[PDB]
């Protein structure tokens, strides 16, 4: 003789996809800020399957990105009012611009560089410059859950994305993820433990990227050796436009990167590395932010090798930008007084592959979705159900 | 103190055991906007739970006794096979066809049926 | 799309073994489906020989022992593929042998009931003939 | 093991008809974890009806299938020529997943 009886709070959940908030310790101000210490619950005898191809978290990231970035711009000055002589990569262009009254006008010596120039910006989209009061400085930025709903990592050291994860934990929020935008490589992003590891939608097909998570990490340094100078020329009324690798250590990287490719392609065939063939300049180069100036460098001094079974790059700048293949919006970076220096980590790449025994790879490109999978892997949004009912064989007391 | 969700690997009847972390961790300007209705969804999706829990004869937290004889078509299992053999994520795998049945089953079953009676037996 | 093929017909004498290849295009991997092996034998009912689900080989107490089923997972060069090998044949073990392919990354699927499931993918099929 | 007895060996019918394929469990399955397939001669089974009522992603609205205690039924209506051939009902709520002796179609002439 046995009856139903109803539990509330039984552990179950389903997959689930959901609007989640943010957490942060000047787009990070406003984001409801971390606890001093987080909790993390292991979920023993627990098996999860992840799909970190099939993530909604990534493009709720990637769609908040660009959402958020445009509202960088709204309360900033435009620049739609916006003959030149030099090879040199600026030029010294010299232009008529409206004062602070509609009649008179005013010339101006400037600087801006071959890849800004008529600007490039104005056959495709107005322009906006960004204000000069907030900063692009990338700090952690952790997605969280809210409640009825629950995120679950997988605490496996040496894990591609998908599959059965037999050591399985609950936090509410993912761990502080850089939101670094950069090309090619992967900056200051997570390290994998132990030995290195390779991540694509598809290992058959070429044309899917191909992601790599280093461990050991790669310094990096970049500089604007140039100490620039600043004149806000007057554009009014009160808006202002404000005018003008170790070798050693790369081997060992990618030494252990063939040894990471492992059978994928066979133990036999050989690995080449070619830097990449073409396309949108934001693929051909390891483009990111440092010091608030765009760098953009050109990696083919890294890619180029041969290797069988058994460091200075160039770099150059860009004025404005139209990140994320948006059209419409432009931006102008006003340029920083002094001289600009950047150490980063390098923390991963990402790899393209072409169509006997030659393997081709290049630097990454495309959707910039791919490098929030760089740290979105571990994770997956689950749904809580905790209403249960069952039979226990007691009856309601009359 | 296994924490939320602990015993999720862990059979039903150990896992009853730490029903009271789940349920108190159950409730736990633009771009702010998206933080907001994540706020509101979390009590509306708090309050279905409990209207269901208050439809139901219990309200009570964690366990709730029923009336509802379970017919063997549900399940045909000893509740050693239940208790001591299955995690809820199983059983929940199991019943689901018969799930909202019971749902169902429960309001009549009792209150309609059993907060009736209690207003005639009050009466005297 | 999910094609499954499998390995061509082979002929083969009594108490010799046999390796038959089920290479599954389509399937992105072996952790987010299963592969069952079945054998129908001439103008017969079907019946369960093996599996392997999250990398456990496994096989039924009729076949336990007899047989063995490795799988390898997707390579740059060839999509992921199972094996299913049987030893000592016997004329009984005439039959067709169909691969299978079920998706297991959805919990409440119903295809699945703890590695227990039914067959949403299959192959052409490879006969087996064991005759001296 | 379960047991599953599927009846009848053979029937007749038409296009348009409806038909009705039973399939009993030597016990009861209350998860209804069984599955219906086509197998035309020759050619591999096609997955129709899982766990009862669920069917596969393209396969006509006409089969439903209906599960209570041990017996089964899988039934076609408006038979349609390509519906013709045998099958097949199939257990997995125990350890292994048993096949049925099978239900041949034929036309009727």
């Known amino acids: 003789n046995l009856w139903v009886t109803v539990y509330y709070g039984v552990p179950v959940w389903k997959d689930a996809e959901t609007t989640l908030f943010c957490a942060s310790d000047w787009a990070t101000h406003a984001c409801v800020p971390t606890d001093p210490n987080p909790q993390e619950i292991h979920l023993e005898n627990v098996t999860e399957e992840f799909n970190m191809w099939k993530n909604n978290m990534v493009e709720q990231m990637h769609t908040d990105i660009i959402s958020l970035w445009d509202q960088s711009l709204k309360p900033c000055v435009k620049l739609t009012p916006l003959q030149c002589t030099n090879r040199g990569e600026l030029k010294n262009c010299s232009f008529n611009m409206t004062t602070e009254l509609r009649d008179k006008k005013q010339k101006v010596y400037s600087l801006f560089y071959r890849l800004d120039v008529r600007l490039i910006n104005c056959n495709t989209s107005a322009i906006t410059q960004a204000c000069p009061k907030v900063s692009f400085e990338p700090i952690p930025i952790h997605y969280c859950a809210p409640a009825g709903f629950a995120i679950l990592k997988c605490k496996d050291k040496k894990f591609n994305g998908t599959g059965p994860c037999p050591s399985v934990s609950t936090v509410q929020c993912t761990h502080g993820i850089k939101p670094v935008v950069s090309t090619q490589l992967l900056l200051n992003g997570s390290l994998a433990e132990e030995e290195v590891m390779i991540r694509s939608e598809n290992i058959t097909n070429n044309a899917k990227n191909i992601l790599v998570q280093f461990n050991t990490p790669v310094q990096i340094n970049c500089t604007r050796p140039n100490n620039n100078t600043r004149k806000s020329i007057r554009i009014g009324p009160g808006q202002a436009f404000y005018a003008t690798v170790s070798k050693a250590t790369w081997n060992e990287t990618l030494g252990k990167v063939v040894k990471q490719l492992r059978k994928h392609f066979g133990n036999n065939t050989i690995i080449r590395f070619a830097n990449s063939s073409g396309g949108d300049l934001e693929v051909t180069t390891h483009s990111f932010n440092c010091g608030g100036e765009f760098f953009y460098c050109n990696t083919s001094g890294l890619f180029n090798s041969t290797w069988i079974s058994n460091i200075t790059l160039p770099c150059r700048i860009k004025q404005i930008i139209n990140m994320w293949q948006r059209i419409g919006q432009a931006m102008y970076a006003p340029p920083i007084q002094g001289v600009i220096r950047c150490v980063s980590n390098i923390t991963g790449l990402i790899l393209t592959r072409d169509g006997s025994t030659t393997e081709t790879f290049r630097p990454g490109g495309g959707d910039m979705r791919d490098n929030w999978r760089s740290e979105l892997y571990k994770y997956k949004v689950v749904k809580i159900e905790p209403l249960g009912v069952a039979p226990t064989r007691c009856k309601r007391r009359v | 103190f296994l924490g939320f969700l602990g015993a999720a690997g862990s059979t039903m009847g150990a896992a009853s055991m730490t029903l009271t972390v789940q349920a108190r961790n159950l409730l736990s300007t633009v771009w702010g906007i998206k933080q907001l209705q994540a706020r509101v969804l979390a009590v509306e999706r708090y309050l279905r739970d409990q209207q269901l829990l208050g439809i139901w004869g219990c309200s009570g937290k964690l366990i709730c006794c029923t009336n509802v004889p379970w017919n063997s078509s549900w399940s045909n299992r000893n509740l050693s096979e239940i208790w001591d053999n299955m995690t809820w994520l199983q059983w929940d795998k199991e019943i689901s066809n018969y799930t909202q049945i019971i749902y169902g089953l429960l309001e009549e079953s009792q209150n309609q049926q059993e907060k009736n009676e209690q207003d005639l037996l009050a009466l005297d | 799309q999910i094609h499954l093929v499998q390995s061509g017909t082979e002929v083969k004498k009594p108490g010799s073994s046999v390796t038959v290849s089920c290479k599954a295009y389509?399937?992105?991997?072996?952790?987010?489906?299963?592969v069952n092996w079945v054998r129908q034998a001439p103008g017969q009912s079907l019946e369960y020989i093996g599996q392997?689900?999250?990398?456990?080989?496994?096989?039924?107490?009729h076949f336990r022992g007899r047989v063995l089923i490795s799988a390898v997972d997707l390579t740059g060069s060839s999509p992921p593929i199972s094996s299913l090998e049987i030893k000592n044949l016997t004329s009984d073990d005439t039959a067709v042998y169909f691969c299978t392919t079920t998706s297991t990354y959805d919990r409440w699927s119903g295809l699945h009931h703890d590695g227990v499931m039914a067959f949403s993918s299959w192959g052409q099929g490879t006969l087996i003939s064991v005759s001296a | 093991d379960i047991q599953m007895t599927q009846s009848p060996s053979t029937l007749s019918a038409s296009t348009g008809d409806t038909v009705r394929i039973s399939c009993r469990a030597s016990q009861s399955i209350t998860g209804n974890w069984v599955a219906w397939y086509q197998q035309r001669p020759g050619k591999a089974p096609r997955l129709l009806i899982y766990?009862?009522?669920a069917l596969l992603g393209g396969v006509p609205s006409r089969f439903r299938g209906s599960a209570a205690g041990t017996d089964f039924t899988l039934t076609i209506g408006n038979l349609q020529a390509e519906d013709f051939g045998t099958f097949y009902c199939?257990?997995?709520?125990?350890?292994?997943?048993?096949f049925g002796q099978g239900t041949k179609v034929e036309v009727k002439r």
């Open positions: 392997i689900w999250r990398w456990k080989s496994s096989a039924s107490h």
């Open positions: 389509g399937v992105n991997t072996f952790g987010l489906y299963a």
């Open positions: 766990r009862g009522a």
């Open positions: 199939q257990q997995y709520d125990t350890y292994p997943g048993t």
